[PDB]
Amino acid sequence: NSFSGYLKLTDNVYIKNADIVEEAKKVKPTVVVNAANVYLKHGGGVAGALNKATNNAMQVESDDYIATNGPLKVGGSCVLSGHNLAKHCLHVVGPNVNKGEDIQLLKSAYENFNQHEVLLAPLLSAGIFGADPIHSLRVCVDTVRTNVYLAVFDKNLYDKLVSSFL
Ligand SMILES: O=C(O)C1=C(c2ccc3nccnc3c2)CCC1
């Protein structure tokens, strides 16, 4: 968990402008969080980038998980291998508010982080899921109590989050 160059936002939330894939390779954290969908189909965004970095090993494992256990629910999670990126990958489903999924489930999604002492993660429900990323950072800060290191790819978004917060 050799996190470097993070800005401390609260006693347990840290933020950096970085590619989460590169952070996972440099740090080899105990847990990397995936911004997943209920069928664990890692087609784009952060999910597609993490899967690509494992050379599809994450997708083959995810398919076997779904055949045995069924899909997750919105607001839920499962722990699978982190492959070459981490000891574990915590797959978490935030609501896709553009498909009518309730924004109240974004608190349930962040609650899954509390089963892990330290996590490297993206903001949930940002990008294609449609939630406002600054609102997602506020829910993370209010809900997560363990130590979370957030990676934000886009520098324009990172500066907006740091300005709104501090
Ligand atoms: O900074 C982020 O967590 C966000 C996104 C991201 C991040 C890394 C990605 N890497 C490759 C392709 N697409 C990506 C999208 C999309 C929404 C916010």
From Swiss-Prot:
Stretches assigned to the Macro domain? 1-166
Tell me the first and last residues of the signal peptide.
none
- Name the reaction it catalyses: Thiol-dependent hydrolysis of ester, thioester, amide, peptide and isopeptide bonds formed by the C-terminal Gly of ubiquitin (a 76-residue protein attached to proteins as an intracellular targeting signal)
Q: Outcome of altering S163L?
A: In strain: Gamma/P.1
Briefly describe activity regulation: Inhibited in vitro by GRL-0617.
The cellular location(s) given in this protein's UniProt record come to: Host endoplasmic reticulum membrane
Q: How does it sit in the membrane?
A: Multi-pass membrane protein
**How does this chain assemble?**
May form homohexamers. Interacts with N protein.
The job of this chain, per UniProt, is described as: Responsible for the cleavages located at the N-terminus of the replicase polyprotein. Participates together with nsp4 in the assembly of virally-induced cytoplasmic double-membrane vesicles necessary for viral replication. Antagonizes innate immune induction of type I interferon by blocking the phosphorylation, dimerization and subsequent nuclear translocation of host IRF3. Also prevents host NF-kappa-B signaling. In addition, PL-PRO possesses a deubiquitinating/deISGylating activity and processes both 'Lys-48'- and 'Lys-63'-linked polyubiquitin chains from cellular substrates.
This chain belongs to the protein called Papain-like protease nsp3
Q: Where does this protein come from, organism-wise?
A: Severe acute respiratory syndrome coronavirus 2 (2019-nCoV)
What is this protein's gene name?
rep
Q: Which residues of the full protein are shown?
A: 1026 to 1191 of 7096
